[model samples]
Target: RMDCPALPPGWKKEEVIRKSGLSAGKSDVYYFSPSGKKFRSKPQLARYLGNTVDLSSFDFRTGKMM
Candidate 1:
């Protein structure tokens, strides 16, 4: 997990690489709320964080403001 500046402090971003099967070498991006709620997609995250968070410049995969 790495710090996600685009999100509030305590939020974390993770990238998990597929180690087996046809998807091997591919990676999945995930996020964790301060309370440990897992976010699987940008849409889901937007619904939860949108009201107070502006994601227009946020890069989900890299967890950076681009």
Candidate 2:
């Protein structure tokens, strides 16, 4: 896991690349809250984070703020 500067401090991002599946080379993104909660989608993470984070420029797949 790597820290996401886009989100609040302590938040982290992870990417799992599928190497043996039909979707090989594709990756699944996940976000981990400081409290250990896992978020699999942007909408889910956004809803949980609420107004605490500004994701207008955040890219969940790339885990970057652009």
Task: Write model 2 residue lDDT over 1-66, tens digit each, in one string.
Answer: 888886778988888889986899998988899998999998898889888876778787988777
lDDT against the true structure, per candidate, is: 0.86, 0.86
TM-score of every candidate relative to the true structure: 0.84, 0.83
Cα TM-score of candidate 1: 0.84
**lDDT by residue for model 1 over 1-66, one digit each (tens)?**
887777788998889999999999999999999998999888899889867877877777887778
lDDT of 2 at 8: 74
- Residue pairs in candidate 2 whose N, alpha carbon or C atoms collide under 3 angstroms: none
True-structure RMSD for candidate 1? 1.3
**Which number leads on TM-score?**
1
Candidate 2 — number of clashing residue pairs? 0
> Model 1: runs farther than 4 Å from truth?
none
